[PDB]
Design a protein around this ligand. Structure first.
Ligand SMILES: [Zn+2]
Ligand SMILES: [Zn+2]
Ligand SMILES: [Zn+2]
Length: 178
């Protein structure tokens, strides 16, 4: 196994996947690394299994169909994995915890949102469709762009949104387009 967390790239108290060489901090894995379970398989492995069991699941899909899907176990897992892929980028730190807004010339958003809030919502089964999860994730970046206006810091929102969107298209097998 690797000697650093796959998500935050630090050492520490690491749980090792039994079916691949990745390792995780307890609360870096999503869902949080399960108490017992020997062997244990990480989210990367669980997602690869879904694909292997249903190879046609990789054929292209329309985003509008994906969004309307109910949050059954396989969709719950895919959203957990997509969230984890955002945390894998170090620039996620800016979006992880609850923000506050006091900048001359800007007003805070009407509906603040942040990654740990999405993580709690997923854990608590608060989303009934994929659309709920995707709308909260896109709201993070939209709030940031609107609040930071012409400050160059706006680019952090564009960057982390790009990581979200690329991974969304990969995980949910969105039909490739020009
Ligand atoms: Zn970690
Ligand atoms: Zn694994
Ligand atoms: Zn199949």
């Amino acid at each position: 196994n690797s000697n650093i967390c796959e998500v935050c790239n630090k050492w520490g108290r690491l749980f090792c996947c039994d079916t691949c060489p990745r390792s995780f901090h307890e609360h870096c894995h999503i869902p949080s690394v399960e108490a017992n379970k020997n062997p244990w398989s990480c989210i990367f492995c669980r997602i690869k299994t879904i694909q292997e069991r249903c190879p046609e699941s990789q054929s292209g899909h329309q985003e509008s169909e994906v969004l309307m899907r109910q949050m059954l176990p396989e969709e719950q897992l895919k959203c957990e994995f997509l969230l984890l892929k955002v945390y894998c980028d170090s620039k996620s730190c800016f979006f992880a915890s609850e923000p506050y807004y006091n900048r001359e010339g800007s007003q805070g958003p009407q509906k603040p949102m942040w990654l740990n809030k999405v993580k709690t919502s997923l854990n608590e089964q608060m989303y009934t469709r994929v659309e709920g999860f995707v709308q909260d994730m896109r709201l993070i970046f939209h709030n940031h762009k609107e609040f930071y206006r012409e400050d160059k810091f706006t680019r952090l929102g564009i960057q982390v949104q790009d990581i979200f969107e690329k991974n969304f298209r990969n995980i949910f097998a969105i039909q490739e387009t020009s």
